[PDB]
């Protein structure tokens, strides 16, 4: 089951309106339904607003300030891959650093979109967002630093030269090297672009898109764990609830929370499959108990397989043992329902087979006599035993009914013997 989604316009994902970080639930239902692997490239534009121009070129064809906006499009070069675009723009206060580090945590490519040239303020700002996403192999996202509006030096050498530290040890050169060295090791792969309709300006914006479409990889987690639309939803809920609660987002707790949710979903898909198979193949008045248990075993082994194909790092087999106890409870319930259905069905058979019989004795039709009453009851037991499928509780309910009619049979014998003497 694969559901490919293509949306025409971007939506709001995280809201920083007022003071609390609110999550747009409608954007999560669209994201969760995505089954393909996602390539999340986050676009963060500082200072001047860029009318989300880079986001539209990456999508294949309004203000995104205090919050993150998401846009899911199919990858143009990678088949069966979903391109997820995150756009956000913003001395800037501390509330925008939280959403920038969020976009950095959710992304596999971080597009830093500033203006003019690389100043100390933009480096200090990028250094600040890397601290909220704690860093304590290749799951770190790559940096794409774009510069708008402007000894031959290439843009790549400029970015590598804008981060080259100067030797020294005073508390004003160390503070000059600390942010420029903290992002040197944070982003292992770096790329720089210089921007300036003009026929030459689109040349740099297309090779920027060609670099994003050819280099940006599927987002992964520590442990070689590919991320799709469902797992990115849990990453957002884990990271947002971490920031909104005052905690620093730890990544080892995000993967455990994701594992505990995919396992809870696994035991539900197993029970759902078991309920479907059991509800479609079982009519309660079964012929024999063994035929009901064989139906349960076939549905049980299929449910266990559905769990194993959807589980993810089952800790101590706690979810598998939980599933096996629920299946055993359904085995005891269906066997109890099988006996009740056999008793209730067989009770309705006696009301119709012995209905006219106990109604005939009420009018004294055997008050002759009794030898014709025992042979008529015996005749009705042959019709009851030759019913097509009545369950396994057929013998116990018949005897329980016959022992309740002993007083009626003894009374007919008294009347039959009372008139033979006269």
As a whole number of angstroms, the distance between CA 385 and CA 388 comes to 8
- State both tokens at 77: 């070069």
* Best CA proximity match to 126, nearest among 145, 147, 154: 145
* Parallel/antiparallel/unpaired status of strands 109-115 and 142-148: parallel
How many residues are recorded in the chain?
A: 422
Phi, psi of 326 (to 5 degrees): -70, -35
Numbered residues of the known binding site for GTP: 45-52, 148-149
Numbered residues of the known binding site: 45-52, 148-149
């Amino acid at each position: 089951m694969a559901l490919e989604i293509h949306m025409s316009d971007p939506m709001c994902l995280i809201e920083n309106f007022n003071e609390q970080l609110k999550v747009n639930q409608e954007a999560l239902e669209i994201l969760s339904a995505i089954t393909q692997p996602v390539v999340v490239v986050a676009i963060v534009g500082l200072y001047r607003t860029g009318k989300s121009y880079l986001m539209n070129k990456l999508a294949g064809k309004q203000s995104h300030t205090k919050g993150i906006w998401i846009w899911c499009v199919p990858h143009p070069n990678w088949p069966n891959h979903t391109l997820v675009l995150l756009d956000t723009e913003g001395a800037d206060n501390k509330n925008d650093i939280q959403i920038f580090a969020l976009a950095l945590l959710l992304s596999s490519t971080f597009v830093y979109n500033t203006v003019n040239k690389i100043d100390q303020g933009a480096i200090d700002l990028l250094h600040n967002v890397t601290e909220l996403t704690d860093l304590l192999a290749s799951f770190f996202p790559d940096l794409v630093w774009t510069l708008r509006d402007f000894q031959l030096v290439t843009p790549d050498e400029y970015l590598e030269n804008s981060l080259r530290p100067k030797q020294g040890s005073d508390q004003r050169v160390q503070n000059f090297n600390l942010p420029r060295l903290c992002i040197q090791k944070f982003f292992p792969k770096k790329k720089c672009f210089i921007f300036d309709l003009e026929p030459e300006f689109v040349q740099q914006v297309t090779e920027f898109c060609s670099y994003i479409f050819s280099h940006s990889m599927t987002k992964t987690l520590p442990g070689g764990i590919m991320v799709n639309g469902s797992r990115l939803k849990n990453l957002v809920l884990t990271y947002v609830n971490a920031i909104s609660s005052g905690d620093l987002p730890c990544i080892e707790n995000a993967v455990l929370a994701l594992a505990q949710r995919e396992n809870s979903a696994a035991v539900q898909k197993a029970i759902a499959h078991y309920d479907q198979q059991m509800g479609q193949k079982v009519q309660l008045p079964m012929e024999t108990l063994q035929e009901l248990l064989d139906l349960h075993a076939t549905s049980e082994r299929e449910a266990i397989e559905v769990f194993m194909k959807n589980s993810f790092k089952d800790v101590d087999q706690s979810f598998q043992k939980e599933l096996e106890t629920l299946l055993d409870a359904k085995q005891n319930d269906i066997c109890k329902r099988n006996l009740e259905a056999s008793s209730d069905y067989c009770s309705a058979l006696l009301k119709d087979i012995f209905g006219p019989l106990e109604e005939a004795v009420k009018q004294g039709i055997y008050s002759k006599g009794h030898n014709l009453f025992i042979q008529k009851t015996e005749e009705l037991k042959a019709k009851y035993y030759r019913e097509p499928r009545k369950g396994i509780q057929a013998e116990e309910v018949l005897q329980k009914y016959l022992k309740s009619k002993e007083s009626v049979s003894h009374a007919i014998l008294q009347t039959d013997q009372a008139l033979t003497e006269t």
